[PDB]
Specification:
Strand order of the largest sheet: 1-2-3-5-4
Strand content: 5-15%
Helix content: 40-55%
Shape: globular
Number of helices: 19
CATH class of the largest domain: Mainly Alpha
Largest sheet: 5 strands, antiparallel
Protein name: non-specific serine/threonine protein kinase
CATH architecture of the largest domain: Orthogonal Bundle
Distance between the termini: 49 Å
Cofactor: Mg(2+)
Keywords: ATP-binding, Calcium, Kinase, Metal-binding, Nucleotide-binding, Repeat, Serine/threonine-protein kinase, Transferase
Bound molecules: ligand UWB
Structural class: alpha+beta
Radius of gyration: 24 Å
EC number: 2.7.11.1
InterPro entries: CDPK_Ser/Thr_kinases (IPR050205), EF-hand-dom_pair (IPR011992), EF_Hand_1_Ca_BS (IPR018247), EF_hand_dom (IPR002048), Kinase-like_dom_sf (IPR011009), Prot_kinase_dom (IPR000719), Protein_kinase_ATP_BS (IPR017441), Ser/Thr_kinase_AS (IPR008271)
Length: 454
């Protein structure tokens, strides 16, 4: 008797989109235990290993235990999906918490990096490599100031192939070890990624940077970086030495995780130190830029999904409309909405028939029934979560409350989003015919619609 995920768990709400799938906050129907479930769609994500290889890795991961590593509880599989059930953490992404503080010292950085290295060392002892370590995979356990870091996604990348879509790729290039680019890699790739993260904590800029993804990858692959930025003048020698050893090009010459834990810098600063004010400022700029580019990509995707699902839904209902009345009942709206969830594959949110009944009932309570009006409301439902996140992200990036984003800023944003320069300028030309060389929110939004075939 294979076991079924929704026999045990009900969905509370969506937490977000992470690597390889959606993550939903769920609750055990019997014990009331809350968990975070990552749902991997087989249609969207190809496997790299056989089933046997994956089952044994899962079995090992369920037994591992370390305070800086996400705890995995269960694994389920059906026809369309894999369901990975882990512990929920509520403190959010590390960098989002850091930009909220007024001071940040080498002691704060050292304490963070010790945690990361400790998790990594443990996982490497157990022969598991992350490969895709980056700031998004570092979660704080709770919203308290002290809270431990929990690393998510250890072990995934070995069994599943990453998306080639930019909306899923944002940020990845800064942190990937050069040997991963060329194909021969081992556990030392995780030390490199940590080194890049450390460099960024102490300066607020990527050691390997550029105007688009490929430019970044080119800097990484050559492997040269410098400490010639002004803000490095305030930083201890021992920190730069540890950095150097983690960013050592040839993996066999690069320091191990375990030895980095013993480095003088970790020893000194984790047991007369200024705030790194310039680094906090750079980090909040870095962060805001990354989050706005992500928000702009998800908005464009959400718009295209809606164009696709609106027309599909209408044709399902038209077919269903026996009498040509333009009128369906509740059971019919439910069966058509279900039909949409079968064809499509988008709503981890609609785990079972019961979540679909509730969603239908929410739309009805807002709005025999005219199906064309039901279609209108059901779809806005799914967007504005992305339209209002767009707006939130624009306001967060406009830190001066100017209401405006300059041409230069757009060039940075679209570069990170990997939208071609002559393409966005062309779209900007069609909206900015006053030559202001700056845009307000509504103008920015209009550009994005034009960049996704609207
Ligand atoms: C082998 C490791 O693979 C797995 C398996 C299960 C997971 C469950 C949740 C999550 C996981 N992902 N997220 C959501 C993301 C939203 C925005 N970006 C960062 C976090 C969580 N939020 C809170 N608590 C969690 N446990 C998770 C990741 C998993 C990874």
């Amino acid at each position: 008797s294979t076991a079924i995920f929704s026999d045990r768990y009900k969905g509370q709400r969506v937490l977000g989109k992470g690597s390889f799938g959606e993550v939903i906050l769920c609750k055990d129907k019997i014990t009331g235990q809350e968990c975070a479930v990552k749902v991997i769609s087989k249609r969207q994500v190809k496997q790299k290993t056989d089933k046997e290889s994956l089952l044994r890795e899962v079995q090992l991961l369920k037994q591992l235990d370390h305070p800086n590593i996400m705890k995995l509880y269960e694994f389920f599989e059906d026809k369309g999906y894999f369901y990975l059930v882990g512990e929920v953490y509520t403190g959010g992404e590390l960098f989002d918490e850091i930009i909220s503080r007024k001071r940040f010292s080498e002691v704060d950085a050292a304490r963070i990096i010790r945690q990361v290295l400790s998790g990594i060392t443990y996982m490497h002892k157990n022969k598991i490599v992350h490969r895709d370590l980056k700031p998004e995979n570092l979660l704080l356990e709770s919203k308290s100031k002290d809270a431990n870091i929990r690393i998510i996604d250890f072990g995934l990348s070995t069994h599943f192939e990453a998306s080639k879509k930019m909306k899923d790729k944002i940020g990845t290039a800064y942190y990937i070890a050069p040997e991963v680019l060329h194909g021969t890699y081992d556990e030392k790739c995780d030390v490199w990624s940590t080194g890049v993260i450390l460099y960024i904590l102490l300066s607020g800029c990527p050691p390997f940077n550029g105007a688009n993804e490929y430019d970044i990858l080119k800097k990484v692959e050559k492997g040269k970086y410098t400490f010639e930025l002004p803000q490095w003048k305030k930083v201890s020698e021992s920190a730069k030495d540890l950095i150097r050893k983690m960013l050592t090009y040839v993996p066999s010459m690069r320091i191990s995780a375990r030895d980095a834990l013993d480095h003088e810098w970790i020893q000194t600063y984790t047991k007369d130190v200024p705030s790194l004010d310039n680094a906090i400022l750079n980090i909040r700029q870095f962060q805001g830029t990354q989050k706005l580019a992500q928000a702009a990509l998800l908005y464009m995707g959400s718009k295209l999904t809606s164009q696709d699902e609106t027309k599909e839904l209408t044709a399902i209902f038209h077919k269903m409309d026996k009498n040509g009345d333009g009128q369906l009942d509740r059971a019919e709206l439910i069966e058509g909405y279900k039909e949409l969830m079968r064809m499509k594959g988008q709503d981890a949110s609609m785990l079972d028939a019961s979540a679909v009944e509730h969603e239908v009932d929410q739309v009805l309570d807002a709005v025999y029934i005219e199906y064309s009006e039901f279609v209108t409301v059901a779809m806005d439902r799914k967007t504005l979560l992305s339209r209002e996140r767009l707006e939130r992200a624009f306001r967060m990036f406009d830190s001066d409350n100017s209401g405006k984003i300059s041409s230069t800023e757009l060039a940075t944003i679209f570069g990170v989003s990997d939208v071609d320069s002559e393409t966005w300028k062309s779209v900007l030309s069609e909206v900015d015919k006053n030559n202001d060389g700056e845009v307000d929110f509504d103008e920015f939004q209009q550009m994005l619609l034009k960049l996704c075939g609207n």
